[PDB]
Ligand binder design. Structure first.
Ligand SMILES: Nc1ncnc2c1ncn2[C@@H]1O[C@H](COP(=O)(O)OP(=O)(O)OP(O)(O)=S)[C@@H](O)[C@H]1O
Ligand SMILES: Nc1ncnc2c1ncn2[C@@H]1O[C@H](COP(=O)(O)OP(=O)(O)O)[C@@H](O)[C@H]1O
Ligand SMILES: [Mg+2]
Lengths: 308, 309
């Protein structure tokens, strides 16, 4: 399922325009690529990009997690790491302050130290040249000392609906399910600009279409399945629709107030503060005015209300 | 507790060279070389260590083998001055971890100390004052070759004589205020097994008998009846050792017997027979340990008044 070429990678055009240059230069100079840091929201394809980079350079790759790592970091750098090989570390911001300090000598001078057994004298290993790739959601999650050893720093942006449609069609042709292009476009539009969301949504749609016995997933069947899942034309869930309703019909675009936030939902200020608001702000239907949160005209028109 | 080397009772052969070594060490204003004292238990090596320390005019640091690994550093760095004396009684009981921390302090006077403690931390080498270490072991076999290699002077403690034991008995009687004659103390020392503890115990028992008898002075004869009532020969064997020899000679013909059969005949524990009564039956020429059993020598026949084989 994972692509093995920058050409097969779907929709990170701006990032690829420079990644191709850097990889071409590194290959021409016959030396390992400089350490790379990938930003961007989850689900966009960072691990796939790491695998694509390794395949482009023709070298082995050793994905490991952030909180997976003491001396075990040197254990995994010493045995399986030959001349330059991508070492992907997902969630680089979660490193403890015990191996992060050990990363700097290893990724600057390629030397590591291990002490155990008492003797217990320091043993310094001449690590082979290698490239490290790290992934984190935001620039501010990692410390400034860590955002200095990375030669290349790149950002990863949300996919457009067309690119998600192409990915859904590729998944369908790989699995062996025939789908019309318009159904894939609708599925991509309902996806919140995320690849794995589109994958899961297509899997659910094909699950709903298999029981009906339809051989081709038509646009009408896709729309019915998406409505059954509880998604509108903008991809908002039922929780988003109901919070928008209880804002617009109870305050008329004014501040919601902390007291009334849990009154109409009977829920703690949990997912409301981190799972619901970010997408509503991203879609542009909610604006954080200093006086209070204001539902824009997009909310009024989207919720089936007459124009003001 | 003797203080000077002239007050020590009966280590004449050792004292003769000890005087020379101590005088040579004092003349050079240099600490004595490390000393190791061999000898069977019960001969007073700690008293000799105290006498040596007093003669050198230096304080003590007395410690046994099984005392507490890291306490060696504590005892070496706490109360050791220039030329201080450390006496490790039963030095063959030191653990290997504690053994491989002392010879650096014997050949170079540098000790590595664990400073961080707790988890696996680092160590620092610390300099110590020059000192002399006296070791005392009854089992030379368990002393490894490296440990024996660092000892400059090695000497042996030998068994006392009836006269030195008599002198010890006289000293104890004088301390306790009991009047005893020279020949009585000589008899008590003769019936001892060349050991000071045994001589003192015999003297105390004879004192009990004489005091119960209401006698103000212990003479030769009173000691003789006291030791006869104690069941003792002219050589120091109790009734049990004579019984062992008589059973070995009469019941089994003196030939090889074995521990189990002899112990069954005597109604005694085989380990008790082997580890309590036999070692003094040997060392007197009264018994042998053949691979086929235990044999009685001709000295056993002569001692018991039996015809020779
Ligand atoms: N030669 C001696 N002169 C005077 N007192 C002695 C002598 N030997 C031992 N003692 C006394 O014995 C007591 C100390 O015990 P010791 O018999 O010296 O220990 P030890 O010689 O090491 O015997 P073992 O076999 O090691 S238990 C003190 O009361 C000393 O006065
Ligand atoms: N551009 C792309 N083209 C094809 N498949 C993709 C692309 N981006 C992501 N995928 C799919 O998504 C999966 C990896 O996404 P994921 O691991 O969720 O991203 P992240 O590592 O940021 O969490 C892969 O199985 C891959 O098939
Ligand atoms: Mg002893």
């Amino acid at each position: 399922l994972r692509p093995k070429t920058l050409d097969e990678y779907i929709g990170q055009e701006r990032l690829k325009q420079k990644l191709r240059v850097y990889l071409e230069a590194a290959k021409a100079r016959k030396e390992p690529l400089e350490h790379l840091l990938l930003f961007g929201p989850p689900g966009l394809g960072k691990t796939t990009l790491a695998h694509v980079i390794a395949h482009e350079l023709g070298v082995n790759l050793r994905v490991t997690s952030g909180p997976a790592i003491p001396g075990d970091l040197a254990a995994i750098l010493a045995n399986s790491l030959e001349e330059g090989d991508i070492l992907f570390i997902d969630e680089i911001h979660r490193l403890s302050r015990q191996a992060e300090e050990h990363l700097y000598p290893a990724m600057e001078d390629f030397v590591m130290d291990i002490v155990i057994g008492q003797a217990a004298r320091t043993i310094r290993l001449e690590l082979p040249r290698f490239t490290l790739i790290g992934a984190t959601t935001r620039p501010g999650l990692i410390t400034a000392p860590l955002l200095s050893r990375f030669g290349i720093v790149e950002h990863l942006e949300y996919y457009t609906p067309e690119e998600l449609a192409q990915g859904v069609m590729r998944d369908a042709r790989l699995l062996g399910v025939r789908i019309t292009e318009e159904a894939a476009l609708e599925i991509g539009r309902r996806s919140r600009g995320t690849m794995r969301v589109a994958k899961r949504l297509f899997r659910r749609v094909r699950d709903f279409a298999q029981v009906a016995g339809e051989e081709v997933i038509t646009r009408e069947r896709a729309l019915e399945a998406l409505a059954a899942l509880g998604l509108d034309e903008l991809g908002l869930e039922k929780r988003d629709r109901e919070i928008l309703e209880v804002l617009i019909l109870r305050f008329g675009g004014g501040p919601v107030g902390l007291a009334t936030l849990a009154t109409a939902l009977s829920e703690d200020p949990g997912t409301l503060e981190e799972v619901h608001e970010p997408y509503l702000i991203r879609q542009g239907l909610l604006k954080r005015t200093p006086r209070g949160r204001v539902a824009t005209e997009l909310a009024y028109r989207h919720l089936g209300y007459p124009p003001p």
